[PDB]
Scaffold this active site. Sequence first.
Site, PDB file in Angstrom:
ATOM      1  NE  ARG A  17     114.532 -51.626 -19.833  1.00 24.93           N
ATOM      2  CZ  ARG A  17     114.954 -52.691 -20.512  1.00 24.93           C
ATOM      3  NH1 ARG A  17     114.664 -53.937 -20.124  1.00 24.93           N
ATOM      4  NH2 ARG A  17     115.717 -52.495 -21.590  1.00 24.93           N
ATOM      5  N   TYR A 141     122.529 -38.477 -30.497  1.00 20.90           N
ATOM      6  CA  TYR A 141     121.103 -38.601 -30.064  1.00 20.90           C
ATOM      7  C   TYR A 141     120.309 -37.389 -30.586  1.00 20.90           C
ATOM      8  CB  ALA A 143     121.873 -35.764 -35.322  1.00 21.95           C
TER       9      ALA A 143
END
Lengths: 232, 243, 238, 240
Positions: A17, A141, A143
């Site tokens: 998607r 997220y 890092a």
Amino acid sequence: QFMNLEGKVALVTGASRGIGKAIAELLAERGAKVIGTATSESGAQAISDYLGDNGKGMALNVTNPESIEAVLKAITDEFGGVDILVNNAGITLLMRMKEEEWSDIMETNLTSIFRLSKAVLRGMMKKRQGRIINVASQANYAAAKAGVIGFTKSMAREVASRGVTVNTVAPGFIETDMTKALNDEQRTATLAQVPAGRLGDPREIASAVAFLASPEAAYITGETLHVNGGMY
Amino acid sequence: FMNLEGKVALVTGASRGIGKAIAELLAERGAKVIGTATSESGAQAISDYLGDNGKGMALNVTNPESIEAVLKAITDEFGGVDILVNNAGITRDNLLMRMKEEEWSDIMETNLTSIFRLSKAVLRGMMKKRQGRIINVASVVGTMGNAGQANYAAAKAGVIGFTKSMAREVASRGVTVNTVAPGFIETDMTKALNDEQRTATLAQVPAGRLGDPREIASAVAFLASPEAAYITGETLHVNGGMY
Amino acid sequence: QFMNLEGKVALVTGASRGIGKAIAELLAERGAKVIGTATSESGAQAISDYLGDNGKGMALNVTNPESIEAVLKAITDEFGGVDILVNNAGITRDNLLMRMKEEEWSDIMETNLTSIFRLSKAVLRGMMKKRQGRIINVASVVGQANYAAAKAGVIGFTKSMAREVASRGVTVNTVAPGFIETDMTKALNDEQRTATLAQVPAGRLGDPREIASAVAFLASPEAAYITGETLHVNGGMY
Amino acid sequence: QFMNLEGKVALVTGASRGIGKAIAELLAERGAKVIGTATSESGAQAISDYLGDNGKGMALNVTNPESIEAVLKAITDEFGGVDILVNNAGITRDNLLMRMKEEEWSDIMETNLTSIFRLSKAVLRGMMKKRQGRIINVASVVGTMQANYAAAKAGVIGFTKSMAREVASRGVTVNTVAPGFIETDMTKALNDEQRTATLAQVPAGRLGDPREIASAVAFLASPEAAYITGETLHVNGGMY
């Protein structure tokens, strides 16, 4: 003949998607034979359904070496090696963020890049032609995203002389089924961050990817292309 | 001025070079300093050079239990950690195309996930005091330059990403989080090269010399001081102009 | 219908040769009506000669407001406002800072930085009225403290301006070439060529067409969500 | 002996108030002989008044080569060459580009960017002779954000990196300090709702103090920052 991908085999991870799907569809429209992946078999079948003749879907877990190996073999046998790899599969409070949240993000969003990239590189270097494009859409997220960019620059340097480019596309706020489900006060708040004053469309990320994947982007490597309506 | 009296500092990986220079300078500025090594004898050598100004302890930054034990011991004897210096720069050179998955994940665990664990373990105490310093030190660049450290590049960039992101969450509680990024620093390995080889490696460095470990220490000590309270989320490069 | 520029009017400054020319040619090939510029009339005629019916050449000095005004009026009258501006005109005046002269500094500022300000402001009103526009600055990674300042300035200007105009459908970006094959590189000796390529992981110079491609992509409808961006085209050199 | 500037001569441009003043004061406190500048004679006298024995004030227009030359000669004659140059003098001329005037643009270029080129070059020779020097550009405060200024500020950073590379091997470092939102006379004159709104952009939840910019400058100016060059040091409480 401009930005044409006839004859190229593209693997797009996480193509069920949104962004992933838009990318897979655009690459097919530009002539690529496209293999899109999902984590389940039914996911893979839905991908086959929207690609029809232009490719197929496969089940893949990017944290599992065996799954990676099996998928690449199947692709190689049926289509020939991967010319274009788009790493789009990924997932998402520090004083309480848990060991497992951190390491699942590292494995799924960063180490996966390393593994898949290394598994397709030999074939690409033998052909002297290749494209790897990482799509990098919260301290865990951040890092991982920064690591993907560090990896991209560094690997680009090693493989450039053999005709392979390695780049990242960094989307901003894109219209997703997830973004649509937010309330109107939240939508208005998010758009305040975006000078363009609207969300991006998944097809606009696809365009950036398709461009980098083309023959006309052969001298672009080690680059992060931001598609964010001016947000940073 | 840049005085650290009454502050408790934990410096990981303080046996030698940069780690040692940092631990020494923080002690000279008044901090009570705890330096760590992977082994007991390592910890003893650290105790030996700090004497009265602190002590050494054995710590494995990939092991939660070791972390917990070390922080407890520090807390009991000295009070919570006010200043954490993470050595996040234990690497040997290698190419991305040559390295295997075990090398990759060892670097990730030792250089990147370690930052997350240690940082999270000292944060509560710091936020309660409304005063804290976390400073991540990236690895030195060696003979093979940036090309040679492709194996470390993802981890290093991750440490910087973590630093910016986490600085943002904790700033309002008086804790700063920064990185120091050394360039080519004099080590035992560089000392052993001949002068033609030194000049060749130096051709990348406009300053035309290697940095001294004390120069990294200075940068760390500055960020750790009260006078850097408004600096956070920053990478301070100490590299004589390389790049 | 993909990356098609039919019906758009593009102004490419400094289009006599190399990068500038490649850009003007590619934009024409994608359907734009293209106006390329040179500093002299015979320069402008040579540009007309290679564009034929897809556009024309004009004489322009980007350090002269009157020249700018006259050129824009002529474009507007004949073709309609500028939809796409590519600022490619620039110069170099290399020297060690210890020797660098006032004029070498200020000529670089005026030609490579202030020019971007002037040309950008002069096309913006039209673009905002249409709610559609593209401005693309081309800045070579090329004793260069003057060139470096001006180039970093063009990037700062780009980010800042992008923010003001984004909500009116105008994007503002920079393309940053690395080492590209030009008349100047062709004239170097083989030892010098090998030395410059040692800096480039791709192990070859870029082609002017590869800069043109990047510019044409950003100029297209499909790059409408990209703005404030620097797109580097350098074979891995940074 | 730590971060001590005894025996060094520092020139701080634009030292009448706020950041400039805090810098000049701190460099004096660390032992430097300091010359601070203003655009007028009375400005220069006020600077002399707060420095007393630790230095003096002088009138300087950084857009005027003659003024630059005269000031440097006077400094050289009385104190010896400049060891530390802090380029703090600057202005703003805000406006949307679709209405910004040629003169607004060029005054900013000349005052904030070209001035760095001129002053830097003028002190370099003496610094290279001594094999020791410091140049620090302060690329000023965000003020309730300032669009005109962005090109010049980015240019100063480009110039800094590029120049640092040419002069490093002779013991001269060249850096920039980039302040975020700092408490000035202008921020004091906002209402409380406006102050709160600005602070919403700053994770630290407060404005910086001019002394905190001074500290960063004094650090870079010291012997202990000898290996730092081509760097932008941001002092902004996490903003961005």
